[model samples]
Target: EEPPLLPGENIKDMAKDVTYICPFTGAVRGTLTVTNYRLYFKSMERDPPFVLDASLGVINRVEKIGGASSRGENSYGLETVCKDIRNLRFAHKPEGRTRRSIFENLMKYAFPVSNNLPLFAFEYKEVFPENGWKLYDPLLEYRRQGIPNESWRITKINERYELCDTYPALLVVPANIPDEELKRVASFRSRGRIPVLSWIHPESQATITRCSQPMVGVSGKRSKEDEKYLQAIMDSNAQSHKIFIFDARPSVNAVANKAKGGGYESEDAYQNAELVFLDIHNIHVMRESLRKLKEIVYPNIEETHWLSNLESTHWLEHIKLILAGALRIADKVESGKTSVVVHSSDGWDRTAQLTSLAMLMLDGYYRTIRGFEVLVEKEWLSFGHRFQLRVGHGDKNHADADRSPVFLQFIDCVWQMTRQFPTAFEFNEYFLITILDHLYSCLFGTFLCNSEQQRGKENLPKRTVSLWSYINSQLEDFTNPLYGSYSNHVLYPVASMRHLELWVGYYIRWNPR
Candidate 1:
């Protein structure tokens, strides 16, 4: 398959017979290429092509290795380490200029070295110490706190797949639901991502769930199995609330070709839930907007016309659609008294945005820094947002079709809410911006690639700095000036242009600590 490209991304360089380490086997021999989107490494020796995005979050620093002082395989080596979770070790022969060219290209897109500590450092040793930092996990807490019995069994779904992820990490499901019942939901297709419950309201008892697209296109037919899954979620609530399925991306017709001119007619596909296609632009559009945002920042501010770029100026329009969909879900659960499920091509990108943002509105706990961390660990990190691919971890191409500011936008939306109801948030703009900066820094393993299970398989916790530790240690710095006064109210964000202004405090790059 060809590489995924964004709307305006173009290839910059391609080199043959370059060395690349096989992730699965640890063998090195491959073809290496550099693009505006990512660094691609197809191992001639073994395994699938390894991709590294040329971005700051994934690869923090690259340094020269082995020369005259070194021996055999280590000669003319290059060792690059990511601040987040990965480190690369490779070398080139002393024959040609291969290593020189690659290093030059690598730094072209990598974060510049600066003594500025404000945006760079994640100091925690002096403030929040490792021994005192308490980890907060919602699902485990559910087991301990004894949340209503109905949601207890939902807490443990280890049969079909691991419960930690298959369902949203924090969702409460019927305690006694059978594997037979879970099976009926995604019977049409078993592989890839599937839908599962994420949250339930304490007052109205309405629900919120998430998952991937249906297999009713070129991959499979509109089987009765597909309809069965949607039906299962609708019937999940004890009150039997009608489910509202929100498609956070383009319409099914627009995405039909990806399914080879195939998609289910919503009437039949979602027999149990009311289907609504949110006309928000896809990942490419969001990716482009983030790139355009950089132009208005500093050095490049004068090169591009500032006023004409509607995507960046009218950025709220996208945020509006996203928040509006979130509002729909919140209204149904809070006011409409109904359960809702959200999805896109894959449930990770836009669904994470909608579910997490909607959760912020429905549950006040997410308003706190620890509560916010739990929300991320459960929803975004647990459900699998492809942080590695989207941010170009090891791959620095800013315009990859796979890259998008999906998570970044969600943070911005939260920033807006914090602005309106300052006291409602436990952490201020600094907290949000630091998270955004690290989303690119890769300094900690917290926001690395893959799902919770995958990360566990890789031993992430023991390696990276737990984001919570850093934030919890210096909670004072992150505390919002208006935090604590309006803590109980569920703040509804007005998705207007004025409210969603460019987050200068977060996006500005020149600031030194």
Candidate 2:
């Protein structure tokens, strides 16, 4: 029997008499094969064959265990530390001399970016009928929301990325504000990420505009142009005379940011808007929470005090906070019929989570498979969520401070929604798992760089294939069979901790009995 391979995949090395020390299944003899994209092992004795397939991109580092003279059963082997929660160990007989070759291949293929070699995405030759790159057109998506009305207009001011290097080239802003005034407004906001339109209500005209926190430092600096811009945003939503500025940070955190030359907006500065803090924790806290979660869920489950152990991680608490924040935003837009402005410190990590999750609740289109892909493309990718830094893709620097599970948290929030409203989503649990897998897999160009500008500079669309291309080609696998009415209604999921739980299908997937 031959190991299954992807279109662009080819075996680089193969070893016999390899013992895989599986945590659950004990020791199993297998043939280990290393490819350009994955590390695959298949046991020969099993009736149907026991296969362990993993993307090399998920490997953080490869360590040779116990040198040439080590003794004991399954003791002389190589151990792989992965970005995911699982660890893989395979013992090779010292006389076989196969350990060195496997270790070298893993190093070269797994960390291609660090090794000055091309990513597997560049060599991936899969073709599909649907071109996923054509899925998200800025103009078309904006038109879907009925933008370019009397209140707002689309501008190409940042066509060369001169206005904001992190924001997309095309932006939707207040119709009355000129491009020159936008430059002044950009300077007042952190990283020059001025307020831009994300989603707009169909009938009420209430909108979800997102950007970075205002640059109100220790001296409490303010800008007239920035104040006028929020006024314009309020004016666009005639349904409500006032707008809400939802800061995705704790009140104390906002106060602490002032020392770093960044601070939240003072209510007195913008008289027409109401400021609200969502109390979501920062990126460092999120990184630590996920680390704790991985420890408890993988290899073995804490059988005695499972609930307490899970609660200690506070993983679900973070998920609840995120979902609750989005619920608040959606309620203001849909029920309150008031416009809202959302931002964290940088407007990329927690900001994207709030906006996209809010839009998912307000609009049913995002609950569908295709619409969900578009939502990710627009809010997370186009708006610059720093996927490369967050996932540490193809990089050996796993301990980088910038490496956090921001996108993973967003997906977890979505999974909670699907669990609450089983019939509402068009995609199933497997779809979400696939997305997270490829997020670390580095087999596709869908998630590579920090921003749209970097992706353009890297020529991602021309050189590599999109993940959507692969998913769209085989739609049946991800389609939710129970999906019923594709209704245009709001879905307000219960964002309580009691209702939230760890995504066992994801976090503990490797420990199935």
Candidate 3:
């Protein structure tokens, strides 16, 4: 009696372990071994064609081993012998056209067979352990060290409250705010929010000192009246509440040096505050520095805050990595306690990227546990005809569809590498919002309307709408809205939209190029 197949055993694995005879040949093929096996069906003109399974197998005898279907018991069967034995010659076949047609059909369905083969040596070498394989551990370092409470509830900004369900700690980098404006923004009486201002330029040092009422100098390298300004801000804020002024100009270079494996000069300067600010003026510079920082200080730092300058050119890849690093730091700061402050020079462009990345990650996490069906339904209904016009009729040629692969891959890497808790629903939402936002941002540059155009009443739309509305309705939604008085929907003209579409197409079709 034959032994029973196991529950999970597939036909291919089953064939490998068992002895079997060739149905086409009377000769016994013993201890049959199959390699490169593939299965598919062929079509006949009048009837359903028989299924074809092709492979190379070996048969062993007492003295010698040979290919299957050889004439002699121990003879090595060559390809020629097998072809003759199996009547594989095209000319010899009675139904040559039907057989050739069947073979073509079999080739078309061969993907499943080709896909099951073992990965190439190079692929295995690239992904396996001992070769840059990153093992994810949420609490690996924190379990060894202790968690801190100040990481949580530091600063809260727009759209971040929707992420963690609690207000986050804020680290404000007020590089654009003048010294006089800084006093107003930072003062408890004027703004009612004592924001921790991390000033970028040393030129602002004189302005910081002039705004000070009672001044006392601290010991440090004074570049431009730095001692007096530091003392004044520190003394005034210390008397009223906790006010800390970091010589951020020095600290910026110090942090940059530390990132490069050099000694930090301003380590003591950062000791005054519960949190530290990382000032990044340019995205490319930040990318180079942060890549190094991830190797060096990232392991030691429990919480890392990033505030970007307004003018830096942005990339989606950088945004993903930043969010991943921020979440990694947040997990370490205090079990669900740490937060990151993401600000820009004007608190708009850089801020938008940070906020959008956070929201995308959170939404992705939520959708995974639940389902995206409802969310898709709700958004579809909310968008109405506009949504249909944007994505209807299975139009894979659309720019949005073309851009999806690159965007999705970046999102996937972020979720895989950085997300503490991610789900399928959240992933769906992230992709949805990301495509929508990209379309929106491309339509109107960072600033929605031209400053000069905004001055004229004639330039205004008959029905004024928010940025989100403009994106969802005109850019993303496929259907044109029905206009009453105008008789036709007005389309906003943007020359760069075509360029952006081309860029997205190139990014999708030729990734990492």
Candidate 4:
């Protein structure tokens, strides 16, 4: 099996004998060819020797394999790593500077710190008129506005391992958490679910927790001990903590599912924690909305009918509900000053929408370029929003039962918020569209799996294109025209039809080429 090569690529340098470890096939002897675009390793004699391609845009680190002089059969050479996993290995004669030369050239494109980058990655530091006179301090604005809650900071629980291990994803948790209480805090979380601190208002101490719904009738059940644990977590701080669980599924379904014993814990189970319903329609509505959005995008795209197209199918209505739910969750933690937990039935689709947007609304850094990148990484990718199922990657069916543009909608909502407050973001529309295109394009592994666990099993980061690199190379291109000055003022997106109009440039993707 060989990695696909694009047409415009041609060989710049070639090495007759090179060894590479292929993902599908084992170690194979191949002639390594470096092109202007990427690296291709062709097996020397296996009828059609396995060809491996590692693009220049992917290289992140290059290092020499030590102790090659006296190693075993097919021993050391030059080991190069990319943004994803490094499966490519090259073996040259001992003491040959060939490895060194190849690595140097690779560095030109990979680590472009000083050289090779300006052509693609440019940073525009000047304040744009759109941002106006307001100075933007990404770091301090969030800190000055202050993210409150003791459980709000990172602690030893995550210190032992990444937050992803203990929960379904990585999140900001209480810092300097007592080492002894770590086990106590750990005890309360429901099995097979993620309950992480999502947001907290610095002043009111209001909080938001994100988790998976408890299996009520099926296999999942609520326990008084678990309820006590939830209460204990909130009360651990100096002041007694009260938690409100915002369920994002429609009420009818959430209740009917109780027959399977799948639902939220009863109020009687929690002396402190109470439940609130968001009434967001289920997967069926989401699928239909995506269908209607496609109608507005495709062969049906006529300017005259565009307005009716929007109204014909509550496409914007769904977007409005999602953003509105996020607003409700955020306001509780922000202005209302209380801790809130948000979750969908499975803690995937609607949950991702609620938490990620809540962060964008409350935190200013997330509005910036790199911050937004990490926000997607942590919330959507790391938490497992089911990209493979949602985007229906590969040649797979696009209409899978679980499929929905969950992440796409979240990004769209962010776009609406960004459009409303142009001065707030450091990145522009191009960056957002670039992200959405790839979410469905399957060109990169950034959005490949359903969970952090799944990505680790596949070793994604090293094996897939780092989406950040593509955008980083051309920073100025994605620079926001109205990137604002420092403002701690948080955004509350008006998720009305007026604001959630179709993103013409993005939807015109009848052919994105």
* Total clashing pairs for each candidate: 27, 0, 22, 36
Q: Could you tell me the lDDT of residue 104 within candidate 1? A: 78
Task: Please give, for residues 2-84, the per-residue lDDT of candidate 3 as tens digits.
Answer: 12222221223211111222333223222221112222112232143223333221000011124333434543322211110
Global Cα RMSD, each model: 13.0, 1.4, 24.0, 14.4
Best by TM-score: 2
Candidate 3 Cα errors over 4 Å, as ranges: 1-281, 284-321, 332-467, 470-506, 510-513
Query: Taking the tens digit of each residue's C-alpha lDDT, what string does model 1 give over 174-250?
Result: 54555555555444433335466677777665677777766566654665644665565566566764778887767
Model 4, TM vs. native? 0.65
Off by over 4 Å in 1: 1-128, 131-134, 141-148, 155-172, 187-192, 218-220, 223-226, 238-241, 252-258, 261-265, 300-305, 310-314, 396-399, 509-513
The best candidate by lDDT is 2
TM-score for each predicted model, relative to the true structure: 0.70, 0.97, 0.27, 0.65
Question: Judged by TM-score relative to the true structure, which candidate is superior, 1 or 4?
Answer: 1
Local accuracy by lDDT, each model = 0.63, 0.90, 0.25, 0.63
lDDT of 2 by residue, 1-513 (tens): 247888889998889879899899788898999888999999877887889899998898888887666565547889898777888999988687788889888888888888998889999998889889889989998999998999999999998899998899899999999999999999999998999999999989999999999999898889999999999999998769789999999999999997688888887999988999989999999999988888887798868988888899889999999999999999999989999999989899999999999999998888999999999999999999899988877777767899888999999999999998888999999999999999988888999999999999999999999999999998999999989854679999998877887788888888748
